Scaffold this active site. Structure first.
Site, mmCIF file in Angstrom:
data_model
loop_
_atom_site.group_PDB
_atom_site.id
_atom_site.type_symbol
_atom_site.label_atom_id
_atom_site.label_comp_id
_atom_site.label_asym_id
_atom_site.label_seq_id
_atom_site.Cartn_x
_atom_site.Cartn_y
_atom_site.Cartn_z
ATOM 1 N N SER A 1 0.802 -1.223 0.000
ATOM 2 C CA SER A 1 0.000 0.000 0.000
ATOM 3 C C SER A 1 0.835 1.273 0.000
ATOM 4 C CB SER A 1 -0.947 -0.005 1.206
ATOM 5 O OG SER A 1 -0.237 0.209 2.413
ATOM 6 N N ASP B 1 4.667 6.992 -12.651
ATOM 7 C CA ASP B 1 3.754 7.693 -13.546
ATOM 8 C C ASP B 1 4.252 9.094 -13.867
ATOM 9 O OD1 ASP B 1 2.020 5.645 -13.991
ATOM 10 O OD2 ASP B 1 0.337 6.500 -12.874
ATOM 11 N N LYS C 1 -2.325 -3.967 -3.541
ATOM 12 C CA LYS C 1 -3.233 -3.654 -2.438
ATOM 13 C C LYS C 1 -3.671 -2.197 -2.569
ATOM 14 C CE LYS C 1 -3.175 -2.821 2.529
ATOM 15 N NZ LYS C 1 -2.271 -2.704 3.706
#
Lengths: 379, 50, 368, 50
Positions: free
Chosen positions: A256, A267, A281
């Site tokens: 997470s 990104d 997750k």
């Protein structure tokens, strides 16, 4: 009314089940049943467990500061960490924990033994030890003290300008830890941000870590159910190290918080993610209390990466996929004349002997070297 | 090195939603696997400059 | 009252959960969440599942033959029934199932696995197993088919009067075949009643088989909570073979019905249990009819041996514990239709049973 | 014959902190084990007669 479905069924279980189950205890079993069935991460924290779990959350808490690895199946002393209360007690390697005070912890799994050993931060626990030399158990008292286990350490690499940053767990000062580590070495030219297998937690520090590098970024990239909970804003532009080469190492464990600091960089193309696919997750869990101050832990929001894609059930797909192994070598005679002849603080910096043990760190260093060469091509 | 283990990444109650170089010939030898990897980092660095 | 706690919890769940869960689905995920936590064997069937189960019957659904039962929080294969594809596929008792096809088995109900294996036999299906003494799991591609192989045969031993009756599974004809074989093979004395690998079967036929060799009384006492459902099966006086020696063999892959035949004899000193510990699965569950179309299933009552012990988890502890292997016929030198010494020497647990019959014969003759 | 278990209590047994036959010797020799297994059956047949 609506509770007819559960009220009728729970009547049968009162009489026809073998072991005379009490309706008072049935609800204790129905609540635990419901939460575990919503998803794979919800759980029920009743009154007794409530405060104990709240106090022992991530951070420092009283303990013994002893590493358990079941070396000999008898709770052997694996690592008397330097400066820990156990080391103050003078514990030595080779000892094993047959019992704590009067109970054979070996017959019980570590799941409850760890709970027993990790008690009050002041009340000392009289630990019992057994050494093969003396058949009767020895005695070693470990006075209590909050265990200061840093989550982040920065160690240079012996022969390269590249650092190495380990991130396991997340403490309140993860961002400060990494920032001061970088400050200690102002001339670094690349960081192997190893957050390999780190589950997550403490999102408020992952955002700070990512903001330490990115300049436009995202503030908190989550939406949730209710419109008010979404926080997909932009991050601030006060990042000092905006052009430092990076290569974050991920592994199936990262779930997470290491999945939003790694994914956020990917990104924005601010780093190269090297390793193996991750846990996927894509959710968060608030520990909202109800009834008698008992945390009904439940998922409340689904993290979204900046690009808009979702990590849930999809992983992070590292750019350079490579699994653990050893770096091959070819040799016919020992480089040294003899293992003990001709050879005429170890943690102070990485050395090739440990790099060759882990191919992934070698690949990360190679990616950093390619980044350095590419950056030098722009002169 | 090749993957050897199959971890339990996903469980129950989970959330939802010849004439060319093949991955085999890339796998059998590592020197060609690291040369292609070093191209990926170059592409990433290039995309960072728009 | 206590219902207030549950109402508050469900209201809180309905207020904060991400996916806008409906109340109707919460109850379907609360009842289902309770029974699984109540006891592993329990299960929940809603209206659709209950209707399909009612329409279903034990006909062409031969299946893999695997029998599974919960143990220490994981699914373990009790034993593959003899002659079924699972046996021919190398699956062994004590293996922990991990996946059926791509569906992970972490925290399923036993009913779910049973239904997963059930279906059209010819349909291929894959299974993943974890063996204790072999690293990393396995994979088995198995084609299923209906099985009609008679469950018991009374193959005679070669050079000795002792018989050998292999009760592989307790079908409806188990008690008839054994009696017919004994009648058609008279003047045989000893009987090696082999039960290894017999997962279980009809109770009516376990008591039916035990009835042959016992005249004393209570065979298996079944008790639950209330007295009305409590009942026991006391064998009648018709015991055609109440004198001949016996030596039953039990192995870790037997339970339920094969565990009440072995337990009934042991408690009446009517035979000698030889082998290893038993799996210990001796509870009873039936669909609860009053269910408003949502039939449920709970362990109503369990089995108690006549000695008073319960076999739910304890199992049966054999008198003469001896593990598998090959007899040490070596070092004594420089180096079909009936059981032969070649096969006996390949099965130590069966060699011990024969020896424990010789002592019985000697002690029987010594009294005359 | 050895059971399927490999270690069990094979290492670090410790605990316990001569004039009679112990299970170790019975395990050592199979003939004595068979002799003991042929005395238990005698006891079973003795019980049955009563």
């Amino acid at each position: 009314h609506m509770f007819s479905r559960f009220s009728n069924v729970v009547s049968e279980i009162e009489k026809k089940y073998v072991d005379k189950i009490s309706i008072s205890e049935i609800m204790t079993k129905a609540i635990e049943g419901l939460l575990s069935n919503l998803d794979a991460h919800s759980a029920y924290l009743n009154e007794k467990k409530f405060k104990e779990f709240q106090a022992q959350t991530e951070g420092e808490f009283g303990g013994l500061g002893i590493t358990v690895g079941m070396r000999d199946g008898v709770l052997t002393v694996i690592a008397p960490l330097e400066g820990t209360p156990a080391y103050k007690a003078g514990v030595k390697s080779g000892d094993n924990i047959l019992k704590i005070n009067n109970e054979s912890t070996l017959s019980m799994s570590i799941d409850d033994a760890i709970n027993l050993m990790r008690g009050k931060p002041k009340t000392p626990i009289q630990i019992t030890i057994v050494r093969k030399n003396e058949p009767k158990p020895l005695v070693f008292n470990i006075i209590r003290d909050i265990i200061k286990l840093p989550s982040v350490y920065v160690k240079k690499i012996k022969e390269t300008p590249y650092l190495y940053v380990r991130v396991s767990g997340f403490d309140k000062n993860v961002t400060k830890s990494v920032l001061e580590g970088l400050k200690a070495n102002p001339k670094a030219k690349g960081i192997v941000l190893d957050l390999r297998g780190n589950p997550g937690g403490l999102l408020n520090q992952a955002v700070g870590l990512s903001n330490l590098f990115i300049k436009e970024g995202v503030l908190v990239s989550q939406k949730g159910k209710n419109k008010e909970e979404s926080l997909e804003y932009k991050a601030n532009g006060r990042a000092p190290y905006t052009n430092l080469p990076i290569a974050v190492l991920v592994n199936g464990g990262s779930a997470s918080a290491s999945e939003i600091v790694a994914g956020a960089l990917q990104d924005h193309k601010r780093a190269v993610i090297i390793g193996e696919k991750t846990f996927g997750k894509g959710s968060v869990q608030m520990l909202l209390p109800v009834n008698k101050d008992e945390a009904i832990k439940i998922t409340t929001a689904r993290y979204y990466l900046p690009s808009g894609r979702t990590i849930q059930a999809k992983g992070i797909t590292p750019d350079i996929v490579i699994y653990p192994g050893k770096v091959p070598e070819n040799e016919n005679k020992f480089s040294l004349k003899e293992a003990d002849l001709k050879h005429h603080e170890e943690e102070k910096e990485v050395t090739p002997k440990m790099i060759n043990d882990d191919i992934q760190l070698k690949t990360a260093i190679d990616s950093l070297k390619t980044w350095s060469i590419v950056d030098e091509k722009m002169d």
